[PDB]
């Protein structure tokens, strides 16, 4: 059978927004070289490269989470 995929709803937006936000908090304070390049609070003042990296990885991780949950009936 084809794994189940759900229509768009506020929960998938919550997962993607949260995954991007958690990655933003971790990456700006854990990666080897943040604050490299042009500059953009509670964050470590990440650079434009670090922020775009965290948003791109937030989409990557977020898509994996929502597809994984929807596959298993919310795990």
């Amino acid at each position: 059978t084809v794994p189940n995929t759900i229509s768009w709803s506020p929960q998938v937006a919550l997962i993607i927004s949260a995954s991007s936000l958690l990655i933003l908090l971790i990456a700006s304070r854990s990666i080897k070289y943040p604050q490299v390049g042009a500059k953009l609070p509670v964050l470590g003042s990440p650079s434009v490269g670090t922020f775009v990296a965290s948003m791109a990885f937030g989409h990557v991780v977020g898509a994996g989470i929502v597809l994984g949950l929807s596959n298993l009936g919310w795990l």
Binding site: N71, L72, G73, W74, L75
Partner: protein, 739 residues
């Protein structure tokens, strides 16, 4: 000198055979090793604990593998009440055909042993169904043992050896072992029960291949986060539920029904799941009590050293000086070991007392031999653990206690009124022994003279009242839970006694062991048990408190925990060390546990026979125990082999004798002492030296066993014979008359 032992030059220079013996007896006494520091001591102990955990995991893996390989687990699933579980196969190449036929049973086509450890019922309850699952569990436990062995090796490497401060940090260890080791483990076990065990008990297979997308409850996890917890308690298993099937099966994962499942006669799986959930929550809460790295949390040293109760000047908790104790426990490994052993002994006693009355495993209450074996096993282990707790208490008194850092605290007060403590323990022991033995032999004389009505038969009215207060209406009392109108039974403010119906149904069921009916014989045997407990405690406490010295030997602390004596002077000082007190107390522990297991076994044998009147009328005099318990039930055991053939009890028949042999040998090590054997050995040395063609010659001079070594060897033989004889008798008398 020899390389062996590596940890003692004094032993390595010993030119006699003693060097070998003591090398085995002091190998794990790390603190006495040459050039031992505290940090090295703790690191070696850490690695040894890793090794012991690996050994435990390998043992569990071996049990699982042998059941999956040579057992009959799948056949036993289809009929737990009539199929004999198989422990493992028998390969004894010196068997005869009658023995091979006798031991080929339980549906097997080869000689097998019958499992009595209860692992079949346990694995059945927790949802295991196939031999492949047991094999996977065995492989996983092999891998886990490998992991722990590697961890033990790794934490000995220079970079990974923990510092002494890491071992001494008590508060983080307590936090992690309460919240994580106890709490998180309990939560994970409840998760296993909810996700796997309960669906399997409801005829639904849940494994690694489908547990991710098979919710345990229809309400899902949404009901938990929205506060709709009651949805988990809706639609429980019906009283007509058939285990391992969907017939009469509900959907609830956390009920609080109480009592027993009507068919399996064991605790409800959902009840145990909710139990472990609540226990996990409580232990995770308890694991946040002490401060580690964030300011919040109690400091145990501050609590023990505190002297102000909200401003008022108090000498300590309950107005008792507890100051200086934090360093006492934190620096004494023997004090911690004493608490750990005492706690484990109490836990084993509670395990034994609570599994027979409230069986947790499906149909295990109807496997009589398994019940007896488990109860006797855990009670004897508890007795050994208690003996060890007090032995290491004495070791703490000698090695780790100094009066200066404990000046004026509660431990010093106990040491100061040790005389009153010991004298009052002796008085309690004397009173109990005198009156219990006197009443027993009075009943003996009255029954022997044909006057059984003249016996003193004191009713156990207090325990009967407790049973009635727990809901037992047999005695006619109308108090608390046996009174439906009592405020305890109604719980007037809230009426949340959702446990009471099932609990009362289990209590008043006559076919289980929940609060068995008790009469005068039970009274007398409980007082015998109290006598045994008090005498064993007297021996152990007198040894621990006198370990530092007495009037006979004021300077005993300078001689260590285990030494033979102080010579024949001052009247004679045989068996004067605290080690000798532990040695003597092992005898009393064995005797007390023998009384306890005799009582349990005879009562349950009478119940299972359908002849409760035999126990009720014969347990009030000691001839009843001697005749109707030992002599009456030894017949099938001693007829396992005879001039007319052999049956499956033959092994027990042999072991029953084997124990009697070992016990007898112990007397030789306990009655005869060293000098006799030393002189005999000298004569044998002359004989060997003067005999031609005997080219052999000792590299270690043959000497008689030391005094302490002789006591230890005699005690070991005594205990081994005790255990083997009673185990053979128990198994033969229960299995020979039942499944």
């Amino acid at each position: 000198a020899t390389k062996f032992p590596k940890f003692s030059q004094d032993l390595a220079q010993d030119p006699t055979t003693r060097r070998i013996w003591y090398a085995m007896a002091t190998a794990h006494d790390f603190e006495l090793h040459d050039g031992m520091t505290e940090e090295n001591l703790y690191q070696k102990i850490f690695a040894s604990h890793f090794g012991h955990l690996a050994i435990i995991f390998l043992w569990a893996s071996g049990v699982l593998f042998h059941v999956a390989w040579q057992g009959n687990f799948e056949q036993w699933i289809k009929d737990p009440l009539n199929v004999r579980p198989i422990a493992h196969a028998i390969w004894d190449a010196q068997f005869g055909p009658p023995a091979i036929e006798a031991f080929t049973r339980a549906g097997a086509t080869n000689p097998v042993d019958i499992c009595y450890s209860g692992v079949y019922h346990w694995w059945y309850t927790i949802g295991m169904r196939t031999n492949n699952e047991l094999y996977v569990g065995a492989i996983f436990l092999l891998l886990l043992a490998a992991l722990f062995l590697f961890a033990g090796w790794l934490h000995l490497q220079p970079r990974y050896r923990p510092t002494l401060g890491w071992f001494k940090s008590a508060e983080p260890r307590l936090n992690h072992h309460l919240a994580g080791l106890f709490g998180v483990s309990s939560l994970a076990w409840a998760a296993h029960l909810i996700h796997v065990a309960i669906p399997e008990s409801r005829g639904q297979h849940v494994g690694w291949d489908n547990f991710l997308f098979t919710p345990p409850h229809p309400a899902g996890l949404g009901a938990f986060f929205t506060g709709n917890w009651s949805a988990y308690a809706q639609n429980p298993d019906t009283a007509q539920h058939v285990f391992n099937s969907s017939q009469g099966a509900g959907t609830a994962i956390l009920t609080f029904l109480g009592g027993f499942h009507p068919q399996t006669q064991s605790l409800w799986l959902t009840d145990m799941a909710h139990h472990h959930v609540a226990i996990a929550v409580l232990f995770i809460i308890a694991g946040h009590m002490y401060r580690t790295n964030w300011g919040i949390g109690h400091s145990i040293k501050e609590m023990l050293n505190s002297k102000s109760f909200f401003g008022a000047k108090v000498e300590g908790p309950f107005n008792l000086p507890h100051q200086g104790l934090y360093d006492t426990i934190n620096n004494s490994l023997h004090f911690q070991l004493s608490f750990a052993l005492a706690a484990l002994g109490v836990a084993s006693s509670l395990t034994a007392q609570h599994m027979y009355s409230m069986p947790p495993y499906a149909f295990i209450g109807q496997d009589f031999t398994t019940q007896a074996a488990l109860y006797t096993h855990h009670q004897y282990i508890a007795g050994f653990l208690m003996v060890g707790a007090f032995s290491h208490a004495g070791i703490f008194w000698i090695r780790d206690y100094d009066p200066e850092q404990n000046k004026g605290n509660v431990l010093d007060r106990m040491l100061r009124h040790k005389e009153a403590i010991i004298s009052h323990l002796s008085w309690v022991s004397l009173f109990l022994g005198f009156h219990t033995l006197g009443l027993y032999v009075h009943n003996d004389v009255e029954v022997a003279f044909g006057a059984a009505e003249k016996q003193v038969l004191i009713e156990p009215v207090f325990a009967q009242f407790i049973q009635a207060a727990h809901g037992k209406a047999l005695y006619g009392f109308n108090t608390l839970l046996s009174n439906p109108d009592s405020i305890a039974s109604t719980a007037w403010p809230n009426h949340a006694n959702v446990w009471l119906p099932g609990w009362l149904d289990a209590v008043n069921n006559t076919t289980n062991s929940l609060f068995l009916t008790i009469g005068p014989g039970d009274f007398y045997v409980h007082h015998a048990i109290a006598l045994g407990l008090h005498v064993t405690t007297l021996v152990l406490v007198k040894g621990a408190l006198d370990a530092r010295g007495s009037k006979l030997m004021p300077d005993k602390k300078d001689f260590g925990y285990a030494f033979p004596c102080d010579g024949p002077g001052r009247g004679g000082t045989c068996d004067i060390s605290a080690w000798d007190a532990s040695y003597l107390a092992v005898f009393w522990m064995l005797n007390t546990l023998g009384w306890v297991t005799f009582y349990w076994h005879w009562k349950h044998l009478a119940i299972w026979e359908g002849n409760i009147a035999q126990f009720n009328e014969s347990s009030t005099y000691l001839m009843g125990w001697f005749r109707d318990y030992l002599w009456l039930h030894s017949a099938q055991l001693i007829n396992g082999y005879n001039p007319y053939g052999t049956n499956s009890l033959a092994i027990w028949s042999w072991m029953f004798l084997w124990g009697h042999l070992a016990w007898a040998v112990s007397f030789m090590f306990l009655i005869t002492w060293r000098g006799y054997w030393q002189e005999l050995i000298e004569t044998l040395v002359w004989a060997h030296e003067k005999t031609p063609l005997s080219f052999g010659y000792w590299r270690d001079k043959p000497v008689a066993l030391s005094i302490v070594q002789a006591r230890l060897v005699g005690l070991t033989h005594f205990t081994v014979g005790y255990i083997a004889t009673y185990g053979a008798f128990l198994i033969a008398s229960t299995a020979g008359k039942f499944g």
